[PDB]
Write a structure and sequence with these properties.
homodimer; Jelly Rolls; four-stranded antiparallel beta sheet; 24% strand; alpha+beta; binds FE2/S2 (inorganic) cluster; 206 residues; three-stranded antiparallel beta sheet; metal-binding (chains A, B); Arc Repressor Mutant, subunit A
Amino acid sequence: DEIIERKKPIQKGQELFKAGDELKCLYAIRSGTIKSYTITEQGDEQITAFHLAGDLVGFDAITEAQHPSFAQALETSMVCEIPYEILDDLSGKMPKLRQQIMRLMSNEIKGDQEMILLLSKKNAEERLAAFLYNLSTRFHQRGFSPREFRLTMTRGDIGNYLGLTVETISRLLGRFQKTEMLTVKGKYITINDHDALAELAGSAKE
Amino acid sequence: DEIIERKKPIQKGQELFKAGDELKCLYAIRSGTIKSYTITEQGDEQITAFHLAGDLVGFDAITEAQHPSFAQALETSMVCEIPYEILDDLSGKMPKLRQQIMRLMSNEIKGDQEMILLLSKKNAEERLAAFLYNLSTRFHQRGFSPREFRLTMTRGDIGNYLGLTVETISRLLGRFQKTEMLTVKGKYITINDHDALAELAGSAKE
Ligand code: FES
Ligand code: FES
């Protein structure tokens, strides 16, 4: 009867919600970048995922109508916030919509499962490769140059997420640059050899 | 019009499906235990999750109508296999059903996110504690003695999943037994101090 695509101006640094917040809205990334993290008892930040354009945020909060995690813009971002009730209401009416919602949640499970394997079996070189490959192909997927993209998150955040040093991360980028596999200019990454990167990415060797 | 709860006798050791298999059916655990794993390029097993009674299996396969992972019974198990089409068809008709399906997938994301934090921030003592606590409360949740439960998976599989040695795992159980926090008899675990375990579980300290 009346669809609305009201978009919202989320500046860098600010939270979509907090860990404990009641699930009012799910948030759809129309543009920009969100990170999801949690704070440990000891008080440290641990990032559990990164969200890009197209991605929906808060799936982990449905079960208990409560956000178990923080979200935060890593840059200026545009969001469409949906009251869950409305969503489920509309996806009950619309097949190819929920079929997509299922598909999107499905994909977040697949991802975390991959992230679990990564943290289990993969070495530092493999993790960064797997990370850059993933980023790269979600861009290419969404519609971007599969070879040039910008790292929106810090190198710190990448290390946090992959369980690696900022030192380590920058050394690795040097290696990838030295091999011509990759071109790095500040936050911009150019892939010159997707093959080689994919190899490195999907290894998991001792 | 016609609901069917046809159940299936899955013996220990056999696969529900393989990595690459086309999503014909989702599988609902009426009884028993399933593990989901993947095989690395190098050929090793890495478990990404454990499924119990109540849990649905194959959510990670919806996005691409393809199973990205293996499943396998860890013991004799009873399953209800659902053609995805039917599921989505019925959940389009039935609100509180999909509302549950969303809830169940939501919960698998939350879990893996936790599993990600675990593998990132938690030490060996914390991981096992977090693992036993989780198991414990899913039992209590489903309806079981929140204090006595059986480890259906091997100690090997637990180590695989938590990135710990079988040696390490058995030493830890000794510690937990020594402190009276826990009672261990073969595969049977008795929780004597949920508090202490929960503490250990939800720590994530250096
Ligand atoms: S307006 Fe279509 S996704 Fe934000
Ligand atoms: S029969 Fe109800 S879940 Fe298997």
